[PDB]
Design a protein around this nucleic acid. Sequence first.
RNA 1: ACGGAAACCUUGAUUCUAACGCUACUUCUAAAUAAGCGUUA
Length: 51
Amino acid sequence: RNPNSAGAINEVNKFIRDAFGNPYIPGSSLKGAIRTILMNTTPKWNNENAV
RNA sequence: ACGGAAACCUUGAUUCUAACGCUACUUCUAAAUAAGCGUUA
């Protein structure tokens, strides 16, 4: 819709920042993505024993 | 008017010198601030 006409953008989800206000990507986020990739492609972790 | 009188068990002395409540030890281990959008129109 038009951002200056209706309610439109009421809330914006903030990006992660440090104490200086500069955005960055935490290592925990990339590590979680890498861990998902590794766990899904290892047959000894992607089995019914994972539940 | 007594085997009695007179006579300090007294003076000077530091329970003192030396000695680390010390040696070794990561508040550590895994962990995406992320998932779901139905039904009506």
